[PDB]
From a paper:
Tpx constitutes part of the bacterial defence system against reactive oxygen species (ROS) and, correspondingly, is upregulated when E. coli is exposed to oxidative stress. Tpx contains three cysteine residues, two of which (C61and C95) form the redox active disulphide bond. ypTpx has a regular thioredoxin-like fold: a seven-stranded β-sheet, with β2 and β6 running anti-parallel to the rest, although with an inserted N-terminal β-hairpin (βN1-βN2) absent from other peroxierdoxins.
The overall oxidised structure, diffracting to a resolution of 1.74 Å and presenting space group P212121, is similar to that of the reduced structure, except for some differences that are mostly confined to the region around the active site (see below). The redox active site of Tpx is made up by CP and CR (C61 and C95 in ypTpx, respectively). There is a conformational change between the two states, involving the partial unfolding of helices α1 and α2, and a shift of 8.4 Å for C61 and 5.1 Å for C95, respectively, as presented in Figure 4. The two structures superpose well, in particular the core parts, with an r.m.s.d of 0.7 Å over 135 Cα. The binding pocket is mostly hydrophobic with one hydrogen bond proposed between the ME0052 p-hydroxyl to the ypTpx I153 carbonyl, which fits with the chemical shift change for the neighbouring T154 amide.
Residue numbers in the entry:
A (entry chain A): -6 to 167
B (entry chain B): 2 to 167
The structure:
Amino acid sequence: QGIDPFTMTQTVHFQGNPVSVAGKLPQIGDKAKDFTLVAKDLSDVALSSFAGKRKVLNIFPSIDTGVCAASVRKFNQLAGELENTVVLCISSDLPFAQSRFCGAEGLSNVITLSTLRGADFKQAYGVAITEGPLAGLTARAVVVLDGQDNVIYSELVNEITTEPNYDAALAALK
Amino acid sequence: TQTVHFQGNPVSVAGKLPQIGDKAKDFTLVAKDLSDVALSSFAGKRKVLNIFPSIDTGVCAASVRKFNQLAGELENTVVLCISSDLPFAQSRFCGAEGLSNVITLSTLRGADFKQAYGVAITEGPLAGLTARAVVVLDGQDNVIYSELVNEITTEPNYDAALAALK
């Protein structure tokens, strides 16, 4: 067989509890699957609309907050300031609730995208939370794509309130 | 499919809004604390299903709030403000916040509710949201009032919905 039976199914932690996440996060070398998500004006935005640019897919359970860690904002700012790069902050919050994201608002080349339309992205990117109070939301993950949509960095955070490795994601773009 | 409008723009709505005399289908939606809330948990109480495309707003009409407050104040009556907004964004609703017997419910889970109640917007910019409607249920989940507004921007007939509860 050409598959790994010993790689355990994706599990993340929330409130000290193991939570299942459907699918498999794309790994370095994989070709990222095309997706369509919803922007702040309710228009549909396809991954193909960013052809040639490097993409930082910064995936969150929710970005609907009035207070955030400086590191969240700093990573989005730094990545968005790099040449030929777009940061896509993705969550299940509706576009009406994403505009007040403490870590994305007013940042150059940082776009918020909603899972409102459609959930095929969640399965394709292995970020769908399927158990507990968070079921229906996306897990916390970072996926960096080069100019040709090849994965150059991938991280599914073990604990949902834990920050991903921002230095490693940025290093992949250098 | 039913046809409604958003500021005059045609909007397609899937399913059939329950009419007076129908037995409303059970549902399980998501409360403010991320707990699951079933329609069956309100057995014996009358229910106002106040369905909105979004309740995520910092400014709303006094009529929206007065209706929820008045219906929620009536004995053996609960108001369920339903939308596709996540529970994190449903607490800001002026029309529901701090009102007795008025609770917000999200389609984060149990989304088949949308088709079952004929409020599912399936195509266009509003696809994935609910249309604007009010469905009033008695103690035994029998519909006593229902209204799917033809123009999403206009309010349902609150005086009629309240009259059905009298």
